[PDB]
Amino acid sequence: PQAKILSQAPTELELQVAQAFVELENSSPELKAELRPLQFKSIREIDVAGGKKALAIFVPVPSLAGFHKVQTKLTRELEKKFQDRHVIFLAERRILPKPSRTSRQVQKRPRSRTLTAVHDKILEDLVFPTEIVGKRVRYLVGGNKIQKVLLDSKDVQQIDYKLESFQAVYNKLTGKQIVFEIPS
Amino acid sequence: KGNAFKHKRALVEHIIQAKADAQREKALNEEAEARRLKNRAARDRRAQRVAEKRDALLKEDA
Amino acid sequence: TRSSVLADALNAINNAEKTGKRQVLIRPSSKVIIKFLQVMQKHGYIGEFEYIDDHRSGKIVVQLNGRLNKCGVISPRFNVKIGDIEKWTANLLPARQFGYVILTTSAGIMDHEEARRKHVSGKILGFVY
Amino acid sequence: GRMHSAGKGISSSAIPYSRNAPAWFKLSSESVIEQIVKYARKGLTPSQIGVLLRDAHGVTQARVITGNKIMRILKSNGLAPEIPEDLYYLIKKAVSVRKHLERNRKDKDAKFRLILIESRIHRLARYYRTVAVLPPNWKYESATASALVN
Amino acid sequence: VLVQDLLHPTAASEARKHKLKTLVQGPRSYFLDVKCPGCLNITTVFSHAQTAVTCESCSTILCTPTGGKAKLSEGTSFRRK
RNA sequence: UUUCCAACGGGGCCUUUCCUUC
Numbered sequence: 181p182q183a184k185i186l187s188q189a190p191t192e193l194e195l196q197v198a199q200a201f202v203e204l205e206n207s208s209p210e211l212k213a214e215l216r217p218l219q220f221k222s223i224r225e226i227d228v229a230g231g232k233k234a235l236a237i238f239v240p241v242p243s244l245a246g247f248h249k250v251q252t253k254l255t256r257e258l259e260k261k262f263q264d265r266h267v268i269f270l271a272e273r274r275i276l277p278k279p280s281r282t283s284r285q286v287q288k289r290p291r292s293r294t295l296t297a298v299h300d301k302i303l304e305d306l307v308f309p310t311e312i313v314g315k316r317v318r319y320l321v322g323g324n325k326i327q328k329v330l331l332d333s334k335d336v337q338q339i340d341y342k343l344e345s346f347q348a349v350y351n352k353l354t355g356k357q358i359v360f361e362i363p364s
Numbered sequence: 365k366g367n368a369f370k371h372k373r374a375l376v377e378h379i380i381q382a383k384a385d386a387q388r389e390k391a392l393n394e395e396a397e398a399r400r401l402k403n404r405a406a407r408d409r410r411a412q413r414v415a416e417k418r419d420a421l422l423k424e425d426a
Numbered sequence: 427t428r429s430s431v432l433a434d435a436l437n438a439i440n441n442a443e444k445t446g447k448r449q450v451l452i453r454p455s456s457k458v459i460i461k462f463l464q465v466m467q468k469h470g471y472i473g474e475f476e477y478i479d480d481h482r483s484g485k486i487v488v489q490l491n492g493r494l495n496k497c498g499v500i501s502p503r504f505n506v507k508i509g510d511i512e513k514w515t516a517n518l519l520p521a522r523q524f525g526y527v528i529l530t531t532s533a534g535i536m537d538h539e540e541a542r543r544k545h546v547s548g549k550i551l552g553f554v555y
Numbered sequence: 556g557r558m559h560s561a562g563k564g565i566s567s568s569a570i571p572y573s574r575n576a577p578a579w580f581k582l583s584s585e586s587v588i589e590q591i592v593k594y595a596r597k598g599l600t601p602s603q604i605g606v607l608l609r610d611a612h613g614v615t616q617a618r619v620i621t622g623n624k625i626m627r628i629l630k631s632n633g634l635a636p637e638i639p640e641d642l643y644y645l646i647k648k649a650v651s652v653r654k655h656l657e658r659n660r661k662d663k664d665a666k667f668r669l670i671l672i673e674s675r676i677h678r679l680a681r682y683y684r685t686v687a688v689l690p691p692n693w694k695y696e697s698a699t700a701s702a703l704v705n
Numbered sequence: 706v707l708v709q710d711l712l713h714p715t716a717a718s719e720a721r722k723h724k725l726k727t728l729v730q731g732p733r734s735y736f737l738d739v740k741c742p743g744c745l746n747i748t749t750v751f752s753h754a755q756t757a758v759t760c761e762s763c764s765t766i767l768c769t770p771t772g773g774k775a776k777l778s779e780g781t782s783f784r785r786k
Numbered sequence: 787u788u789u790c791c792a793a794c795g796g797g798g799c800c801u802u803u804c805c806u807u808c
């Protein structure tokens with residue numbers, strides 16, 4: 181059960197965390213067997229406000245159905261068992277290109293495979309069970325763009341500290357800045 | 365009883381060609397209903413092996 | 427029914443500044459509304475505008491200052507052959523010295539000076555001054 | 556607004572910004588798709604389904620809970636009626652309109668009203684014809700439509 | 706008037722406007738869970754009825770329809786969510 | 787004339803990226 185859940189040969193952190201799951205695995209019936217069916221493709225490491233680098237886990241995305249059933253209990257043991265670390269769960273999506281003129285016909289394209297829909301599921305994954313209740317985009321008089329992503333209410337505690345990591349996490353993926361806010 | 369049948373020979377040739385377009389209508393509605401029904405197997409079979417390998421790469425790693 | 431939304435914006439713009447307002451709520455916006463307002467805010471005729479997301483087609487709040495006499499929209503998008511840019515500036519713009527006719531070219535939404543340097547032509551969109 | 560009279564009146568449903576959730580809603584994709592198919596076997600229209608299910612059960616909307624609109628469900632499960640249900644109530648009305656002109660020919664307003672309704676039917680069909688929900692050559696007519704709806 | 710914050714409008718004034726005329730529109734109807742102490746479990750109902758709702762088993766009533774929100778019938782309770 | 791300097795265009799690269807194909 182060591183490198184099985186890895187779904188790929190490399191590397192080190194992918195092993196450590198893959199080891200970490202199996203240390204959370206044998207707790208017997210409800211703390212395993214619902215955590216075993218899940219898997220992950222890869223892990224990337226990038227910096228955070230808390231000085232604690234971020235650990236971003238990719239998911240094949242049939243599988244975000246069960247991971248979402250766990251999540252909060254899991255990312256509590258992952259940020260504990262692997263600490264000085266911020267642990268988030270992203271889902272690997274396809275991003276098909278917008279065909280050019282000179283390009284020759286490919287199979288059509290769904291809209292959930294589109295670069296913009298994808299980055300709008302990224303922001304949906306980085307945040308979790310709170311919600312996204314609204315958005316805005318300021319175009320600064322410099323010509324810069326900054327996305328105001330507004331969050332919800334209850335349970336929001338869980339990402340409270342995680343705010344400035346998502347902005348960084350998303351800026352290593354995209355090239356666009358993020359900020360958040362809450363009601364009044 | 366209206367016109368459009370100039371004699372026996374035409375009336376027959378009409379009937380000749382009317383049963384021929386009622387077969388091309390039957391054969392195409394049997395064969396493309398064989399295309400639909402028999403691709404419903406390739407959906408239940410390919411949805412089975414992700415439900416059969418769903419308990420198989422679960423149980424066998426125990 | 428709504429026909430050119432680009433014009434339903436630049437109109438709620440030209441009805442804010444005259445009435446003296448510092449901001450306006452325009453709707454639905456667009457890809458092209460954004461890229462108009464972008465060539466505009468770039469030469470300063472407005473400040474920052476903020477895309478709000480309704481779940482349908484959008485709104486914008488545009489914070490505008492004082493400096494904008496008219497920002498217009500050319501309703502049939504006429505085919506401009508790069509001799510005719512000169513004649514489009516000579517008509518609807520207050521002087522040679524400033525002011526901008528904004529068209530569409532294969533090279534994207536831009537002002538007629540960034541057209542004259544890039545050396546591309548296309549369909550006219552509007553103007554701002 | 557309102558092609559066929561002068562009323563400009565804005566009324567509609569206001570969709571919630573929430574594309575997931577209630578999250579106070581439990582149930583499942585299995586639960587409603589079975590409630591859907593069990594009503595659509597009872598004779599109910601894809602409008603009265605989301606109508607009954609919204610007030611009697613919890614369903615805000617059946618497209619947030621299940622990934623497909625109440626029509627696409629009835630189709631894939633083979634409950635999709637021959638003609639759209641909008642187009643059906645139209646033809647159903649023109650029948651009850653024309654039935655009333657035959658019994659009283661002295662009502663001209665009716666004769667007017669019948670024109671509006673029919674004007675709508677023929678244009679709706681013309682769309683459904685364009686994207687092929689109806690067979691190219693499908694047309695309305697007063698004789699076959701009385702039978703068609705019944 | 707002549708300058709204001711449109712992006713950040715007061716919830717006092719925003720609460721009075723029409724449901725299409727809020728900043729991003731949202732519906733003003735709700736849902737609730739109703740009890741008839743004779744029956745031990747609750748049905749979810751929609752604030753605006755139309756169809757006159759009945760509970761799981763017995764045939765009784767819950768609400769009756771009108772133009773606006775459902776009129777609930779006599780002794781009942783409603784939690785909202 | 788190169789070096790400095792900014793300016794204005796041109797082209798090509800990497801990031802999930804047909805620019806058809808051996």
Ligand SMILES: [Mg+2]
Pocket residue numbers: none
């Ligand atoms: Mg358009």
Ligand SMILES: [Mg+2]
Pocket residue numbers: 433434435437438439
């Ligand atoms: Mg306007």
Ligand SMILES: [Mg+2]
Pocket residue numbers: 454455456457483484485
């Ligand atoms: Mg828009």
Ligand SMILES: [Mg+2]
Pocket residue numbers: 442443446447448490491492493
């Ligand atoms: Mg002003």
Ligand SMILES: [Mg+2]
Pocket residue numbers: 556563564565
């Ligand atoms: Mg109207």
Ligand SMILES: [Mg+2]
Pocket residue numbers: 557558559560
């Ligand atoms: Mg009209």
Ligand SMILES: [Mg+2]
Pocket residue numbers: 566567
């Ligand atoms: Mg109404």
Ligand SMILES: [Zn+2]
Pocket residue numbers: 741744759760761762763764765766
């Ligand atoms: Zn009851």
